[PDB]
Amino acid sequence: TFRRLWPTIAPFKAGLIVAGVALILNAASDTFMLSLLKPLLDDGFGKTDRSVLVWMPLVVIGLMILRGITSYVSSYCISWVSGKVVMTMRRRLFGHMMGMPVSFFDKQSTGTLLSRITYDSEQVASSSSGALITVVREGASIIGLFIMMFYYSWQLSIILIVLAPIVSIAIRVVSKRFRNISKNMQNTMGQVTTSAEQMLKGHKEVLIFGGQEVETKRFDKVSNRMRLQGMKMVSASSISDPIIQLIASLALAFVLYAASFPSVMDSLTAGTITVVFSSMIALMRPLKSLTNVNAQFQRGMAACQTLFTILDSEQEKDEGKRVIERATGDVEFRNVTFTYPGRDVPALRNINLKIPAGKTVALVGRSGSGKSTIASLITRFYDIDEGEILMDGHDLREYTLASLRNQVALVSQNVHLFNDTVANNIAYARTEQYSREQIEEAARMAYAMDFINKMDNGLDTVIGENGVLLSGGQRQRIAIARALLRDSPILILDEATSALDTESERAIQAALDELQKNRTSLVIAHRLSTIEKADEIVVVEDGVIVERGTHNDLLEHRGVYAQLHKMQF
Amino acid sequence: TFRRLWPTIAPFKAGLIVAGVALILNAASDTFMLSLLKPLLDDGFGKTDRSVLVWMPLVVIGLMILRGITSYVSSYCISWVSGKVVMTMRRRLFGHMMGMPVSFFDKQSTGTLLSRITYDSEQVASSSSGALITVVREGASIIGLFIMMFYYSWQLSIILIVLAPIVSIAIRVVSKRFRNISKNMQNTMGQVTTSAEQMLKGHKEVLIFGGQEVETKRFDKVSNRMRLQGMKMVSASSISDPIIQLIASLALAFVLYAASFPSVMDSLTAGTITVVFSSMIALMRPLKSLTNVNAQFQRGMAACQTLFTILDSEQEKDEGKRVIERATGDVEFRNVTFTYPGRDVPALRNINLKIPAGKTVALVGRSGSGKSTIASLITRFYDIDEGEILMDGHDLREYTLASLRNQVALVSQNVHLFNDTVANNIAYARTEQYSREQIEEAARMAYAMDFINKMDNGLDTVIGENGVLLSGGQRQRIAIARALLRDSPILILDEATSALDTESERAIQAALDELQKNRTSLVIAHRLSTIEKADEIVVVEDGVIVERGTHNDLLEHRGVYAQLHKMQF
């Protein structure tokens, strides 16, 4: 179909043409190797015992080294072109995916995105390359073989290529005849098989009533029936091979009959004949290879259409351009009803949550639905389905997206530390902005210096995966250091599970207290200490804040907070 | 492979020998077909003679008729041998399967039982036949071709065939080297792809921070890897290809060098070298095929061992020599504990149920746990796990199985009607015992003659599957007719469906009352009318005989019968 990746491969058209010429020369070497038979057959043997036959080994070994060099060069160059186009496709796909919304990553198919970016892309490249090399090198081979046949024997090729379609239509009609006979009788085969099945399904009924002698006689008759049907199957299927071989040898016999001396043929054959036949029994292979070229090309184009469908999806909407340097103004959720995309049930109904500036507000809901959703809603990682999230006098939609990202920071047990040095991870995308001294001080006041000093290289050790592979609490402290260096006016604190890690829960809690001394703290902690520390506490059963107030006030108004507090202890 | 099984195939040895000689002749056909080449080439065209060329087409086409006839005869005769082996194997398998215990019919795999009857029985014969044709035909071709090489060239054959394994080991070591390189490279590729996967899964945390170029740049570096590493996939593999070709052509050079460099060889004429090379390339195939003979043989022998194990498995136990003409005595359980084989939970604990002679007992239970298994137990489908069943003062295990099975008769909504005529189905395995007049008398007394009266051919119509396809209520009517003709002293009724068919339920109930007017009859049933009509009513919830007494008494004492009276309405 329509491919618009040609501008991608246009800069590398030179390498592609070099690969094509290499494949042309490869096919030329192969067909010249085939044509090498005739001088060998005539002069090498018939004329003399020794003469041409000494030159020919050198000629064929030379042709083979030429063929190998051409094949290797073509493979290397087409690999270069494929690698470059797949390089461009991969980086374009990832660049789009950077700004592309969370919706595809919202469990649409996360594991298959890896396939899309690597396996399907290289499948597109390999399919296109395979189609190109196949069509060019097999067209070259076909042209070379045809010119060989016409040059060596002008009159033999026309009769033989006239005969070949006749044999083709004969083979097709015979195969169709025997295939439909086969399936037509296989219907009866299935009938008898079902008869035997129903016969044996009455095992209890046979056992209870009478004996098996009548049953054995019935199975004997049915067995004889399927045995004769199997006779018919094997006979009908086996007679195909004699018939097809007979047709092929009839074609050969007619060819030889034409080769019988008249005035047309045999004037110039000598040992030519085998060469012609050799070429034909070679020529049958590329044409078959040429049959699948279109199918392979269509498969590659379908994969490329999938990739283009991924690419053409709209990026994250960022129409709002209002900028905000510091977000000291409070956050205000006002009757904000959110629905998860792909989820029929409303994830979050209208909620009037207030988050005053420089205060601790704690989400204490235990239902597990909507608790982490608000952390995404405050950050425009999902669209605002309904209601207004007004921060510092303006709604989140109006604000520049990148602004809202840098203003807010979130720290959780789950944190994807990037494959880099710890110092670079501490200031992601801000290493130019933040000095190494600032990074060290941030790690110090986050109480993570023990973990950095533990590793040999320290501030430059590769903390990412396939590197240090540090423990989860250490990842949390790295994240707290990231937020602390950023000094985000708005902090989100998930704390999914409160683990009293030895020698580390005290340090991480101290770091949490250090970070949340100032700035708003939207905390989803299951730890009772943070809940008590919260200036306000909210419990939401996915619809609305059932209870609002202090933890003691929420204890006074039991509702659902009482049993929740029982699980807290 | 300790298959043995030869007594089965011994009487059909003559067909096997005829197939073998025909197949050897078929291989000799190919040998002589290639032998025709040297007269066709050396003395056909290079020679000025004409008639020798006209000789070839007729002889090759007649050779092809010989090949086709030999192939057809071989296929037909080995089909005969295979069909007879399958005949005896299927017969001896099905006889044992009917003799196999009901515990073998454990619902383990009902369709694979047919597969053993159909798929595995044909697999053993097909595999044995394939191994036979492969070894005989391909070995005949191999030995004939070697005789060819030694006949046409006493010298070139030995050098070519001693050089061939050298080329084989060279190909093996080179291919193994490249495969090892590629294989250990695959692990590096797998490791590299994990970096891209990690960066992709980290989108959730890329977006909150600045991300952007520091992501893409990093990805770009990783993007280069599967290009460069990707080149190592295609580069090395590519340079694997011509090298294995090159050395092969080097061998093709060497023999050709040996064609001329000696002053001794000097005896190839023109076509004999072509005959030798053609015979080599035509020999490569049968050597490959002959390598797979052991695999086919062992696979077929494994399927044969499955069938042999099924045949050798112990039948239903028949260690009872006590014979009863008519079971006029009472049937009674004494603390009979039963467990389904393959089930850990005791299906039925100890039960001491007594059934007086003549009187009717009903079993009631919604879930059916424990209720249904008893009706099978009295027929010795599943042997007792513990306890004893006293029939006429002796144990059922003591009684002869075939003798007992005639005493009790089963009636249910689901009855496997055999594909014979209605008259046979009424007197299955008893058509000689009872007269046709008795059969129609039983049909009339069953009060279901009408459905058979309106039937086209009357009592002689094929009634089972691939026939009239009778209705399930009418199947139950046929069963009540079966019992009427048998006049079994013991009756078990299932009555699971409890279907109130219009005008057929009434006749069914009338027939049930007619049959159970006399003789012992226990009835599982959800019908309140039948439960009331029962002389005794029993409720079993898989644990114990919960309630014993009349239905009014079982209503007076709540227990569980009241809950049954709820949905009996």
Side-chain angles (χ1 to χ4, degrees):
Chain A
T1 76
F2 296 97
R3 55 177 208 83
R4 58 158 199 276
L5 65 105
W6 185 32
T8 299
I9 58 136
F12 330 111
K13 189 178 181 182
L16 194 133
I17 290 162
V18 167
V21 164
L23 276 180
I24 288 300
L25 209 174
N26 185 87
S29 87
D30 182 27
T31 191
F32 194 57
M33 205 281 247
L34 254 294
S35 160
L36 185 291
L37 212 65
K38 198 257 178 179
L40 178 147
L41 259 286
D42 263 353
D43 306 323
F45 283 91
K47 180 175 174 294
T48 41
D49 65 317
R50 185 235 62 79
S51 274
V52 165
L53 197 44
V54 171
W55 266 15
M56 289 320 84
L58 180 65
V59 173
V60 64
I61 207 80
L63 269 180
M64 201 46 38
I65 169 56
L66 186 71
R67 185 219 191 87
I69 289 295
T70 48
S71 310
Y72 162 66
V73 164
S74 72
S75 297
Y76 165 71
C77 211
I78 207 78
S79 68
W80 160 272
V81 172
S82 76
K84 272 289 186 69
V85 70
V86 63
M87 172 41 61
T88 302
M89 219 33 48
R90 280 160 131 84
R91 64 183 48 177
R92 200 178 163 194
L93 216 62
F94 194 50
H96 165 48
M97 260 164 153
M98 158 71 199
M100 191 274 258
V102 167
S103 162
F104 280 73
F105 309 110
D106 157 79
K107 189 28 67 195
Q108 209 70 33
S109 52
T110 62
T112 74
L113 298 182
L114 183 60
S115 79
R116 291 290 107 81
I117 182 152
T118 79
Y119 155 78
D120 297 305
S121 190
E122 81 92 34
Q123 187 70 12
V124 165
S126 73
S127 296
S128 163
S129 71
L132 168 37
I133 65 190
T134 315
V135 68
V136 67
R137 83 169 297 266
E138 301 306 74
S141 270
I142 290 291
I143 292 297
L145 290 186
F146 277 153
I147 218 74
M148 256 180 49
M149 302 205 169
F150 272 84
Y151 164 65
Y152 278 136
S153 182
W154 174 31
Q155 269 43 42
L156 189 42
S157 171
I158 208 164
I159 57 176
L160 258 162
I161 203 72
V162 160
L163 263 279
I166 306 303
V167 178
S168 299
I169 61 178
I171 217 59
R172 204 77 70 181
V173 298
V174 167
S175 177
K176 172 184 168 184
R177 272 291 308 271
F178 288 158
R179 275 186 273 100
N180 61 56
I181 290 296
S182 170
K183 183 180 68 65
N184 177 40
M185 169 294 307
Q186 271 287 340
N187 169 60
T188 60
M189 194 41 53
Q191 195 275 327
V192 177
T193 297
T194 311
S195 173
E197 181 264 14
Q198 174 265 355
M199 182 43 87
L200 72 83
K201 281 321 173 212
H203 159 75
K204 291 101 176 66
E205 312 315 314
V206 171
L207 253 59
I208 182 56
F209 260 44
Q212 296 86 321
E213 59 97 359
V214 166
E215 177 54 66
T216 49
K217 289 165 60 180
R218 292 207 66 184
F219 184 79
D220 198 321
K221 295 185 180 183
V222 173
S223 70
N224 183 31
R225 186 173 297 96
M226 61 203 97
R227 185 241 296 163
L228 295 183
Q229 288 199 354
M231 263 315 178
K232 292 153 66 65
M233 170 23 68
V234 176
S235 75
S237 173
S238 72
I239 57 176
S240 75
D241 299 10
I243 290 295
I244 64 187
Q245 294 319 90
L246 192 173
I247 293 296
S249 316
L250 211 180
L252 262 63
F254 189 51
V255 168
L256 271 292
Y257 207 82
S260 72
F261 290 71
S263 53
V264 183
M265 281 324 316
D266 213 304
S267 311
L268 62 80
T269 311
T272 294
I273 170 55
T274 170
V275 184
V276 169
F277 271 129
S278 71
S279 41
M280 221 185 278
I281 63 182
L283 177 137
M284 186 183 189
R285 150 179 167 189
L287 291 203
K288 280 199 307 185
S289 313
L290 194 63
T291 299
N292 289 337
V293 163
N294 209 12
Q296 191 192 19
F297 187 65
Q298 277 287 0
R299 164 167 56 262
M301 189 59 231
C304 174
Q305 267 288 349
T306 315
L307 265 65
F308 282 169
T309 312
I310 268 67
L311 197 145
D312 294 343
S313 169
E314 183 43 80
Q315 267 185 332
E316 190 65 271
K317 56 187 287 181
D318 54 343
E319 298 89 359
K321 66 217 162 296
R322 296 283 294 172
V323 308
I324 180 71
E325 177 265 341
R326 200 69 185 182
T328 67
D330 79 320
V331 172
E332 310 181 6
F333 268 87
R334 206 181 323 171
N335 293 344
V336 169
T337 290
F338 172 74
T339 307
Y340 262 127
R343 298 292 183 193
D344 36 9
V345 54
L348 206 80
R349 293 182 182 175
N350 53 347
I351 272 169
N352 227 52
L353 210 173
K354 191 92 162 187
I355 304 172
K359 301 297 151 196
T360 51
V361 291
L363 196 150
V364 81
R366 52 174 174 176
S367 197
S369 58
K371 318 299 167 279
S372 52
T373 311
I374 200 71
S376 60
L377 265 280
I378 187 157
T379 52
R380 277 214 63 82
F381 300 7
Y382 294 105
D383 52 17
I384 321 183
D385 164 62
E386 183 268 2
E388 59 281 46
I389 315 171
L390 180 124
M391 181 255 278
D392 218 328
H394 319 92
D395 203 55
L396 284 192
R397 318 216 191 104
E398 317 312 316
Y399 280 125
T400 308
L401 270 290
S403 297
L404 185 64
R405 319 310 185 73
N406 63 48
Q407 297 288 59
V408 70
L410 71 82
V411 172
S412 311
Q413 183 152 346
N414 316 326
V415 55
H416 170 277
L417 285 194
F418 303 95
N419 280 10
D420 209 345
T421 74
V422 68
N424 291 340
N425 267 9
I426 288 283
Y428 203 54
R430 307 287 287 281
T431 186
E432 48 165 2
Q433 153 62 14
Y434 293 114
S435 153
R436 181 69 72 84
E437 172 55 33
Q438 296 165 356
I439 290 161
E440 169 267 340
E441 174 45 46
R444 190 233 73 188
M445 152 179 93
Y447 313 118
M449 223 33 60
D450 60 334
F451 311 130
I452 311 311
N453 297 342
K454 189 189 299 183
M455 301 305 78
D456 52 318
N457 207 8
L459 295 166
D460 291 27
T461 189
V462 170
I463 210 83
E465 311 313 295
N466 324 295
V468 166
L469 298 148
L470 80 177
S471 96
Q474 305 187 13
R475 301 190 321 178
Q476 298 194 60
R477 222 158 299 171
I478 291 299
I480 219 73
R482 291 198 304 203
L484 242 194
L485 180 60
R486 292 294 209 83
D487 193 7
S488 163
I490 310 303
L491 160 66
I492 298 182
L493 208 171
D494 185 29
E495 178 48 290
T497 180
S498 45
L500 172 44
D501 190 301
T502 57
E503 190 262 343
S504 324
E505 171 50 44
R506 56 222 77 193
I508 201 176
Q509 197 153 358
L512 289 181
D513 302 347
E514 178 53 47
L515 181 57
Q516 80 199 345
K517 261 156 191 74
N518 207 0
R519 301 146 294 265
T520 69
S521 317
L522 195 278
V523 56
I524 323 301
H526 298 248
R527 192 175 68 253
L528 183 52
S529 172
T530 314
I531 294 157
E532 157 274 338
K533 276 299 301 177
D535 302 330
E536 309 177 12
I537 299 90
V538 296
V539 68
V540 165
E541 197 178 3
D542 211 54
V544 78
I545 315 105
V546 181
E547 312 180 40
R548 317 165 172 72
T550 76
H551 73 297
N552 186 26
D553 293 14
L554 254 64
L555 182 57
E556 293 152 20
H557 323 81
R558 274 84 215 175
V560 289
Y561 177 80
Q563 314 95 338
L564 166 59
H565 209 171
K566 302 301 123 55
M567 71 155 88
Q568 296 310 281
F569 293 149
Chain B
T1 53
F2 51 84
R3 169 226 55 190
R4 303 312 315 274
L5 170 144
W6 203 261
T8 54
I9 203 171
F12 322 109
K13 175 184 59 54
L16 178 139
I17 294 298
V18 168
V21 62
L23 202 80
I24 271 176
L25 202 64
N26 172 254
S29 85
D30 267 322
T31 292
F32 204 55
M33 176 178 73
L34 288 202
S35 185
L36 171 142
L37 204 150
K38 174 254 167 76
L40 163 150
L41 199 46
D42 183 27
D43 286 359
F45 305 1
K47 255 258 192 170
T48 192
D49 183 21
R50 163 166 203 291
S51 60
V52 80
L53 171 44
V54 163
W55 199 295
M56 290 324 88
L58 276 308
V59 56
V60 59
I61 213 73
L63 187 157
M64 201 36 48
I65 315 316
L66 172 137
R67 182 218 177 97
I69 291 298
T70 49
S71 188
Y72 174 46
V73 164
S74 68
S75 34
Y76 166 75
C77 210
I78 187 180
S79 178
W80 192 78
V81 152
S82 82
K84 281 290 168 308
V85 154
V86 164
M87 192 39 51
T88 181
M89 201 46 38
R90 277 207 241 266
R91 186 153 310 108
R92 294 170 182 181
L93 192 73
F94 188 84
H96 216 96
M97 283 265 268
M98 292 335 307
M100 269 265 101
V102 177
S103 53
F104 182 76
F105 286 77
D106 228 346
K107 339 309 157 284
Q108 274 156 11
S109 54
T110 174
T112 77
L113 282 193
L114 179 72
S115 308
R116 296 289 167 285
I117 285 283
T118 44
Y119 168 68
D120 308 39
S121 47
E122 65 82 12
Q123 269 297 132
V124 49
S126 69
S127 307
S128 149
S129 60
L132 183 31
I133 80 172
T134 310
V135 69
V136 170
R137 175 161 159 71
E138 307 309 286
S141 177
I142 288 279
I143 189 63
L145 264 44
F146 282 180
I147 279 284
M148 220 186 178
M149 312 285 187
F150 287 11
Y151 176 75
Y152 285 110
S153 150
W154 190 78
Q155 293 81 354
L156 200 142
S157 319
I158 208 174
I159 83 154
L160 191 151
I161 197 63
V162 70
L163 168 140
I166 305 301
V167 176
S168 80
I169 61 172
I171 291 286
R172 202 79 70 179
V173 297
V174 168
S175 174
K176 185 219 73 178
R177 164 76 174 188
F178 276 100
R179 213 157 51 255
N180 295 358
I181 293 299
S182 70
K183 274 182 290 193
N184 55 61
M185 153 38 59
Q186 299 322 278
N187 313 104
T188 44
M189 183 66 75
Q191 181 267 3
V192 160
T193 318
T194 64
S195 175
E197 164 53 25
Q198 193 251 1
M199 262 188 274
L200 230 43
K201 93 182 47 172
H203 162 270
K204 251 296 312 172
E205 330 301 337
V206 161
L207 274 197
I208 174 50
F209 299 108
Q212 200 189 344
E213 50 259 33
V214 180
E215 243 303 342
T216 67
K217 287 178 177 178
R218 186 183 290 95
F219 168 72
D220 220 10
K221 186 193 293 97
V222 181
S223 78
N224 211 1
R225 304 285 71 68
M226 61 295 278
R227 195 182 73 176
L228 271 289
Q229 286 252 326
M231 292 275 246
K232 283 173 169 277
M233 290 322 177
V234 317
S235 170
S237 295
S238 178
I239 201 71
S240 178
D241 161 67
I243 295 296
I244 61 158
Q245 295 258 349
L246 185 167
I247 49 144
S249 315
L250 201 146
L252 174 137
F254 195 95
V255 55
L256 260 295
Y257 200 96
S260 51
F261 166 76
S263 306
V264 185
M265 202 47 38
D266 302 63
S267 323
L268 292 308
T269 74
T272 299
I273 183 58
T274 81
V275 160
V276 167
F277 283 130
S278 46
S279 51
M280 201 65 28
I281 56 172
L283 179 150
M284 270 302 103
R285 160 162 58 104
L287 271 192
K288 270 183 173 172
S289 319
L290 197 133
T291 325
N292 297 14
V293 65
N294 248 14
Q296 268 188 1
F297 198 76
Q298 272 222 328
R299 203 181 328 95
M301 165 56 188
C304 183
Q305 262 282 349
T306 319
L307 298 180
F308 228 89
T309 48
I310 291 173
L311 173 53
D312 298 344
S313 176
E314 181 53 62
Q315 322 201 1
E316 200 77 81
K317 88 157 279 294
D318 39 18
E319 315 176 0
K321 315 312 167 292
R322 271 284 205 170
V323 178
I324 294 297
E325 167 267 355
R326 180 164 267 278
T328 71
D330 302 44
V331 289
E332 176 265 10
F333 306 88
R334 187 179 318 279
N335 312 339
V336 171
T337 306
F338 176 78
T339 307
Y340 271 97
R343 185 67 67 256
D344 195 5
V345 184
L348 200 84
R349 295 184 180 175
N350 59 316
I351 282 184
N352 209 292
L353 171 55
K354 156 62 94 182
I355 308 182
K359 308 214 178 307
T360 41
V361 308
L363 296 200
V364 185
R366 298 181 270 211
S367 63
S369 305
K371 183 176 62 163
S372 79
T373 181
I374 298 158
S376 324
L377 197 88
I378 197 174
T379 70
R380 285 197 74 193
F381 288 2
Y382 301 107
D383 201 30
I384 62 101
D385 285 61
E386 195 39 74
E388 46 166 18
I389 295 162
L390 261 297
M391 204 302 295
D392 216 333
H394 315 105
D395 310 271
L396 296 190
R397 55 183 128 182
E398 179 186 344
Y399 279 126
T400 300
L401 197 79
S403 306
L404 178 74
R405 292 289 170 74
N406 310 327
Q407 309 323 294
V408 67
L410 159 66
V411 170
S412 78
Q413 82 295 22
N414 56 319
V415 185
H416 169 274
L417 303 186
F418 305 95
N419 287 5
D420 271 350
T421 71
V422 162
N424 295 354
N425 225 46
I426 287 297
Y428 193 61
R430 324 271 271 199
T431 196
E432 88 302 350
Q433 184 172 350
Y434 308 108
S435 164
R436 202 164 199 272
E437 312 320 308
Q438 255 164 335
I439 288 164
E440 58 86 5
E441 284 157 20
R444 184 216 46 256
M445 186 55 12
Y447 200 38
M449 182 46 257
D450 300 355
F451 225 92
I452 311 307
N453 167 249
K454 61 148 282 303
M455 149 47 50
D456 306 353
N457 205 2
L459 305 171
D460 253 333
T461 315
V462 163
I463 184 63
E465 303 299 338
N466 325 296
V468 179
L469 188 59
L470 195 49
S471 36
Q474 272 59 21
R475 299 187 170 88
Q476 201 158 7
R477 280 143 148 259
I478 295 302
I480 214 75
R482 272 179 204 184
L484 262 289
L485 183 55
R486 291 290 197 90
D487 203 279
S488 295
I490 328 298
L491 174 60
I492 64 183
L493 310 177
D494 194 10
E495 199 60 277
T497 182
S498 288
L500 309 181
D501 191 359
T502 324
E503 178 269 347
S504 306
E505 170 48 49
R506 333 303 155 211
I508 280 165
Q509 198 85 2
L512 284 163
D513 304 338
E514 171 52 46
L515 177 57
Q516 82 203 22
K517 193 272 302 178
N518 248 359
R519 296 147 274 98
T520 59
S521 310
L522 64 93
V523 50
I524 293 164
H526 313 132
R527 212 72 72 76
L528 178 56
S529 68
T530 305
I531 289 158
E532 161 268 333
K533 235 293 168 183
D535 299 28
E536 182 73 350
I537 298 88
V538 166
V539 170
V540 163
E541 296 303 303
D542 201 277
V544 80
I545 316 104
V546 174
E547 275 175 300
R548 327 194 67 180
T550 59
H551 65 286
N552 288 334
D553 298 358
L554 297 208
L555 185 58
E556 290 154 20
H557 328 88
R558 291 184 183 174
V560 283
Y561 173 78
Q563 322 310 317
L564 283 304
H565 212 177
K566 298 293 168 296
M567 294 300 293
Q568 269 152 16
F569 286 156

